[PDB]
Structure 1
Amino acid sequence: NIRKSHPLMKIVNNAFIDLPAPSNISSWWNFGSLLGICLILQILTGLFLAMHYTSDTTTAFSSVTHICRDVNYGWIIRYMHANGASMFFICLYMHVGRGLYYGSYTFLETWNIGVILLLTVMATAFMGYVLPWGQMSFWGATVITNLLSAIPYIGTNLVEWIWGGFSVDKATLTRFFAFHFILPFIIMAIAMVHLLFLHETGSNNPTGISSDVDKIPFHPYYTIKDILGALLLILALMLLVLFAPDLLGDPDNYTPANPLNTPPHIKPEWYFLFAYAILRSIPNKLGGVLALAFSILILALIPLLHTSKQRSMMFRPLSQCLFWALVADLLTLTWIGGQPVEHPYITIGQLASVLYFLLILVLMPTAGTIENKLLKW
């Protein structure tokens, strides 16, 4: 009674208690709550960090050290933030992938909002990494921000507008801080709308068939399975932060910023490495950033190239192989992205980039058509 009628409870009830859900969803549906979890864990350790961090160049790095040595338990808080960012990205990558494989993208609004959610956390995380004002924080801030200067007749002014100076100076750090604080709240409102559009149809499932014929209430079933699910997120996260705090950050970004150095290194954090590879594969200022962008906004083209008469990939062998070649190709891309632009690495980084686009834009839709034909559809 009370759960069903009360204005606030309704919402909870309709989203986590009596929500009819397919009795069929597998582990790949857990990344939904996991991102939700990652989002909160990242706001909570993030706030406690802001209680000791200062966004001024001369104390920026020092305040981060202040946290790890002097602030009680500052270190875990710091590393949980650091690693949660990668954990947020692995989950983000599972989630997008899951939808791609299962045809979940046929829910345009939900999906499109998802792309806005992907961009928002990327912009968010990119600003996050600059905050400690480390060698990579500054040069990654430099290299990446400077891309916008490829935009014709507007670009120079644009880069100088967001920079605050003529470089990545004082204005940029405080600036980047403010947006890094405001972004995750906006992300939240958007995730609510993500969930708002999703609730309008309920979840998809591995068969892509349709589950009105067999729904189970979200409660014992998926609350308890999300719990067990969050527990494994914690394990991965904690295993990362306690045993190997600097593993995914790599031993490097320590030593303060130096606007005159330029380390023979320069590469964004791992989650941009595939995009990074695509960009440098193209000899051309404009084209590089054009293809950089296209490598992510292409998710907004996927539903227009569905092509198959079935929604999921569960019953489609050729498509499976092509999907796996996409993921395989995305490893190559990050791997290349994490290496210098010399002999072997250029040409495969070039080839793999063409493949990425050939796969999604031509090979996958073709396989769908072939698949339809083999089934006489």
Structure 2
Amino acid sequence: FILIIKDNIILYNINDSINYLWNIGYIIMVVMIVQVITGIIINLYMNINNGYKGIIYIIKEIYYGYILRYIHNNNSTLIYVVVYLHIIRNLYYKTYYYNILIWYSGMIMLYQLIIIGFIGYILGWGQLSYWGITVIINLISGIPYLILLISGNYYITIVTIKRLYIVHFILPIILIYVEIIHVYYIHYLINNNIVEYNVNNKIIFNNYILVKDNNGIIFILNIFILELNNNIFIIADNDNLIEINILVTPIHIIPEWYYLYWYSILKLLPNKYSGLYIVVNSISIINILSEYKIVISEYKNYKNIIWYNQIIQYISMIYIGIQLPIIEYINYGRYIIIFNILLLIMYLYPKKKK
């Protein structure tokens, strides 16, 4: 494998005109490894018997256990920040027009990540996680008997945790394999540049791009260390530190911040399945945004007005999700969903000739 490493790290040529937005991917890979390592180490001191007490036992009895607990929670937030920012970049520079294979490989990892995260918060045995899996499992309540098979009982119980835990342990290793398929296509299908064309300005990776990529990762580390030890930003809801009572409903059954765009979709649409279905549309339509075009152009380096309104639509929907289900937020949020479809249609539609 040493020759492979030399071909893909030491003699790998990349354009010298790339920005720091081309370093986001390096950070995902590094922060992903950290999340696997910390996860395996936490499991050394806790299992599925009672997470509530187990997390307490890690933070109070294990030496430096608090570091492991808070890194694993905060580095998840970090994973989802960097991934979501990696997508925003790919949309801005339309890096899906000629490198769709790379885009497809990435989306597979996005799907896997969305399942890894949801199930990790039930491992903590907290109120907000108990009642948030009870509300997402009941969306497939139409498929007969499927809820019982997944849950393993008629209500969420330790049985449900013992099985989701195995998916949370194993699915990350598969994600790492898909990361190789992703880096494989990137290296074959050359990366896109800040300029729309292809230019002979490439420089080796280890001597230049890795030094710059490390300056980026160390910048993010400074900020992540401050959050890790001082909680400068509230990235974890406090109601997950309340012991599970199956009789009392939490004040608000909301997910973590990185599922509030699909939680709002589900709370805005008036039919449960319509919501589920609009959450499929969000993660699926974005994979065909260049397929119907017919012009010899990649629609790149224009003012990207449609892009800006899409990125804001995401942020605004996350806000509506935090808010309670007040009627006025529901009406305004339904307009934001209608607007997303029109913006998506604009990306999809080919143009007629004057």
Under a length normalisation based on structure 1, what TM-score does the superposition of the two structures give? 0.89
Specify every segment of 5 or more residues in structure 2 that has no aligned partner in the other structure, as ranges. none
1:295 aligns with 2:282: yes
Q: Does the residue aligned with 2:136 lie in a helix, a strand or coil?
A: helix
Closer/same/farther in 2, CA of residues 196 and 232 from structure 1, 3 Å limit: same
Superposition deviation, residue 227 in structure 1: 0.9
Instruction: Name segments (4+ residues, structure 1) moved above 3 Å.
Output: 305-310
Q: For 2:286 and 2:347, how far apart are their aligned partners in 1?
A: 13
**Residue 4 (structure 2) aligns with:** 11
Specify every segment of 5 or more residues in structure 1 that has no aligned partner in the other structure, as ranges. 1-7
Identical counterparts, % of pairs: 29
1:115-143: per-residue Cα shift (whole Å, max 9, x none)?
11001011001111111010111011111
**Residue 314 (structure 2) aligns with:** 330
**Residue 202 (structure 2) aligns with:** 215
1:228-286: per-residue Cα shift (whole Å, max 9, x none)?
11112212321211110771113221011122211130111111101111122211122
Q: For 1:38 and 1:124, how far apart are their aligned partners in 2?
A: 15
Q: For 1:216 and 1:310, how far apart are their aligned partners in 2?
A: 27
Q: For 1:312 and 1:90, how far apart are their aligned partners in 2?
A: 26
Q: For 1:73 and 1:305, how far apart are their aligned partners in 2?
A: 54
**Residue 152 (structure 2) aligns with:** 164
Q: For 2:41 and 2:295, how far apart are their aligned partners in 1?
A: 49
In proportion to residue count, which structure has more helix? Answer: 1
Question: Of 82, 86, 109, which aligns to 2:77?
Answer: 86
**Residue 3 (structure 1) aligns with:** none
User: What amino acid does structure 2 have at the position aligned with 1:34?
Assistant: I
User: What amino acid does structure 2 have at the position aligned with 1:170?
Assistant: I
User: What amino acid does structure 2 have at the position aligned with 1:343?
Assistant: I
**Residue 355 (structure 1) aligns with:** 339
1:25-44: per-residue Cα shift (whole Å, max 9, x none)?
11111111111011101011
**Residue 135 (structure 1) aligns with:** 127
1:53 aligns with 2:46: yes
1:184 aligns with 2:176: no
User: What amino acid does structure 1 have at the position aligned with 2:41?
Assistant: F
Closer/same/farther in 2, CA of residues 130 and 217 from structure 1, 3 Å limit: same
Q: Does the residue aligned with 1:253 lie in a helix, a strand or coil?
A: helix
Question: Of 12, 31, 39, which aligns to 2:32?
Answer: 39
The answer on whether the counterparts of 1:103 and 1:208 sit within 8 Å (CA) in structure 2 is no
Superposition deviation, residue 333 in structure 1: 0.5
Q: For 2:298 and 2:219, how far apart are their aligned partners in 1?
A: 29
Closer/same/farther in 2, CA of residues 65 and 245 from structure 1, 3 Å limit: farther
Q: For 2:92 and 2:294, how far apart are their aligned partners in 1?
A: 14
The answer on whether the counterparts of 1:133 and 1:257 sit within 8 Å (CA) in structure 2 is yes
1:187-236: per-residue Cα shift (whole Å, max 9, x none)?
0011001111111122111223223x211111211110111111122123
Q: Does the residue aligned with 1:165 lie in a helix, a strand or coil?
A: coil
Under a length normalisation based on structure 2, what TM-score does the superposition of the two structures give? 0.95
Superposition deviation, residue 156 in structure 1: 3.2
Question: Of 232, 238, 250, which aligns to 2:219?
Answer: 232
Q: Does the residue aligned with 2:14 lie in a helix, a strand or coil?
A: strand
The answer on whether the counterparts of 1:80 and 1:237 sit within 8 Å (CA) in structure 2 is no
Superposition deviation, residue 24 in structure 1: 1.4
Superposition deviation, residue 302 in structure 1: 2.1
1:117 aligns with 2:121: no
Q: Does the residue aligned with 2:252 lie in a helix, a strand or coil?
A: coil
**Residue 258 (structure 2) aligns with:** 271
Superposition deviation, residue 369 in structure 1: 4.0
* Coordinate RMSD, CA, aligned: 1.8
Larger deviation, residues 111-120 vs 302-311 = 302-311
Q: Does the residue aligned with 1:82 lie in a helix, a strand or coil?
A: helix
Superposition deviation, residue 305 in structure 1: 4.7
Superposition deviation, residue 171 in structure 1: 1.2
Q: For 2:160 and 2:189, how far apart are their aligned partners in 1?
A: 43
Superposition deviation, residue 12 in structure 1: 0.9
**Residue 257 (structure 1) aligns with:** 244
Alignment of 1:335-350 (within 5 A): 335-350=319-334
Larger deviation, residues 332-341 vs 294-303 = 294-303
